[PDB]
Ligand binder design. Structure first.
Ligand SMILES: N[C@H]1CO[C@H]2[C@@H]1OC[C@H]2OC(=O)Nc1ccccc1
Ligand SMILES: N[C@H]1CO[C@H]2[C@@H]1OC[C@H]2OC(=O)Nc1ccccc1
Length: 340
């Protein structure tokens, strides 16, 4: 397709490109915030809940150690992440509010989403019913239609990266592997359980890898566990490239048919990567009850609302050792991060 969708995406690309070509920089500093709690950690950064001292607003602050970014070969990826986040705008993406750097670290200050990760709720309940999984899946389909139209690939879809907001809708966080890509790209990155066969085989790959990952996510939401799993990654990779996938008997026939077309090992036959693009997915029988405009407008009542007391409640996140945010007397890796 309808002209309203075509015109929506043309305007979205226009607005993205203006920010992409003139990124914002240096819009706050560390001592504007009080530190509250660590919400998660990793090899080269962590995420902390903070409170802005003048306004009282809460935020999730991602802190990356510049020297560890360089050593783990993530320079280009960290520059991709901040440039993309400062340029996008869509209902189901977390908003970037501030960014800045100092002698030691890079900082990205995001909206705080207090309901926690979809992964926690999935494991507490066991599995989601098909209507519940389908509500979340429709939001990811729309978000990928938006990102792919901007020539972006997301490359890290998994339940840990989908936060649940106060109204029960998804907010996608972590753009650490996202990239603007005209054609193909080649980096090995992602989480093993979610990787498409063409990534594992070191091929040049495209946006079809996000549609494969959506197949893995929908299977995991409806079954309670992902389709390909093992103790060592090499064993996971062998199952993925065979693509041999068994479905629980409680799966509907429509769900199995959709999953066979998303978890298609031949990328030239995979739903989302054919001539009709995303409409092969939106028009599939498993989505026949979905009102796509109502989801986009956030007019559907959600299947589940998280329990929390207020905008600063951390009870839906877990506990980590609290470490210092040190800032060196001397500047580190200045050249490498000039554009940040
Ligand atoms: N979590 C982000 C995204 O929604 C919130 C928040 O940031 C401000 C507000 O932004 C939007 O509602 N964005 C939008 C709306 C319609 C079409 C395209 C983009
Ligand atoms: N989203 C989580 C779960 O899948 C990914 C990711 O974390 C690592 C990996 O974990 C599993 O494959 N879990 C599993 C496998 C079989 C039975 C029960 C659980």
């Amino acid at each position: 397709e309808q002209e309203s969708v075509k015109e929506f995406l043309a305007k979205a690309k226009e607005e993205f490109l203006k920010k992409w070509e003139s990124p914002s920089q240096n819009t706050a500093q560390l001592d504007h915030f009080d530190r509250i709690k660590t919400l998660g950690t990793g090899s080269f950064g962590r995420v902390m809940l903070v409170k802005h001292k003048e306004t009282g607003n809460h935020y999730a602050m991602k802190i990356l150690d510049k020297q560890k970014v360089v050593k783990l070969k993530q320079i280009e990826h960290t520059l991709n992440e901040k440039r993309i986040l400062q340029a996008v705008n869509f209902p189901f993406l977390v908003k970037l509010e501030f960014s800045f750097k100092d002698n030691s670290n890079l900082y990205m200050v995001m909206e705080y989403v207090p309901g926690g990760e979809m992964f926690s709720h999935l494991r507490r309940i066991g599995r989601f019913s098909e209507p519940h999984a389908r509500f979340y899946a429709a939001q990811i389909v729309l978000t990928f239609e938006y990102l792919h139209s901007l020539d972006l690939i997301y490359r890290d879809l998994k339940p840990e990266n989908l936060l649940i907001d106060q109204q029960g809708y998804i907010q996608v966080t972590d753009f650490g592997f996202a990239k603007r890509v005209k054609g193909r790209t080649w980096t090995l990155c992602g989480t093993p359980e979610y990787l498409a066969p063409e990534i594992i085989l070191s091929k040049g790959y495209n946006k079809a890898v996000d549609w494969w990952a959506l197949g893995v996510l929908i299977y995991e939401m409806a079954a309670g566990y992902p389709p390909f799993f093992a103790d060592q990654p090499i064993q996971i990779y062998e199952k993925i490239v065979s693509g041999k996938v068994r479905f629980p008997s409680h799966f509907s026939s429509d769900l199995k048919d959709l999953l066979r077309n998303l978890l298609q090992v031949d990328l030239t036959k995979r739903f989302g990567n054919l001539k009709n693009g995303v409409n092969d997915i939106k028009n599939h029988k498993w989505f026949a009850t979905t009102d796509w405009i109502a989801i986009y407008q956030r007019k559907v009542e959600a299947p589940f609302i998280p329990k929390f007391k207020g905008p600063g409640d951390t009870s839906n996140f877990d506990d980590y050792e609290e470490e210092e945010i040190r800032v060196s007397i001397n500047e580190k890796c200045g050249k490498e991060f000039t554009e940040f």
